[PDB]
Amino acid sequence: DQGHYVEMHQPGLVADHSLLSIHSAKVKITVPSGAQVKYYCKCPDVRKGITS
Amino acid sequence: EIVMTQSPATLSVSPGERATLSCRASQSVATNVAWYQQKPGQAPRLLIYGASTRATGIPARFSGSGSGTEFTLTISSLQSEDFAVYYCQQCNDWLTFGQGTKVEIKR
């Protein structure tokens, strides 16, 4: 069929926890790939997210 | 903590924009390490010339100015003069321990 159809919508946002590893003294982001994971500690971090 | 194996000096003869690079062996000598691009003499300007190796802190004449230019937290020896001559060790006071930069002696 193609008389029927569903729009494969653009997906969105996903919060995570595991990437926030420890820096042996404090937080340590660990991004697998291209995941600009918005992160916001007490001060504004890169809420745009980082692959770094 | 993040052992800051500082690059030894900021090379300058004429007054010019040098960078007192202060490497960290473990990581980048950074704000988390709080390298702070310090241009610490014994008594004089023995403070964070940088501000967490990002901006010119207390002991800078814009010569220990905060700058992590690499894993080396360059105490940015911008217009380094004879008075700018100081052991601009981006002295890391990291979150776990100091692990400060040995020396990046501007001159």
UniProtKB/Swiss-Prot annotation, chain A:
The protein's superkingdom reads: Viruses
Q: What kind of membrane protein is this, topologically?
A: Single-pass type I membrane protein
Q: Where in the cell is it found?
A: Virion membrane; Host cell membrane
Modifications after synthesis and translation? Palmitoylated via thioester bonds. These palmitoylations may induce disruption of the C-terminus transmembrane. This would result in the reorientation of E2 C-terminus from lumenal to cytoplasmic side.
Summary of subunit composition and partner proteins: Interacts with spike glycoprotein E1. Processing of the precursor of protein E3/E2 into E2 and E3 results in a heterodimer of the spike glycoproteins E2 and E1. Spike at virion surface are constituted of a trimer of E2-E1 heterodimers. Interacts with 6K protein. E2-E1 heterodimers interact with host VLDLR or LRP8/APOER2 to mediate viral entry. Interacts (via E2-A) with host VLDLR (via class A repeats); this interaction mediates viral entry into host cell. Interacts with host LRP8/APOER2 (via class A repeats); this interaction mediates viral entry into host cell.
Role, per record? Plays a role in viral attachment to target host cell, by binding to the cell receptors VLDLR or LRP8/APOER2. Synthesized as a p62 precursor which is processed by furin at the cell membrane just before virion budding, giving rise to E2-E1 heterodimer. The p62-E1 heterodimer is stable, whereas E2-E1 is unstable and dissociate at low pH. p62 is processed at the last step, presumably to avoid E1 fusion activation before its final export to cell surface.
The identity of this protein, by name, is: Spike glycoprotein E2
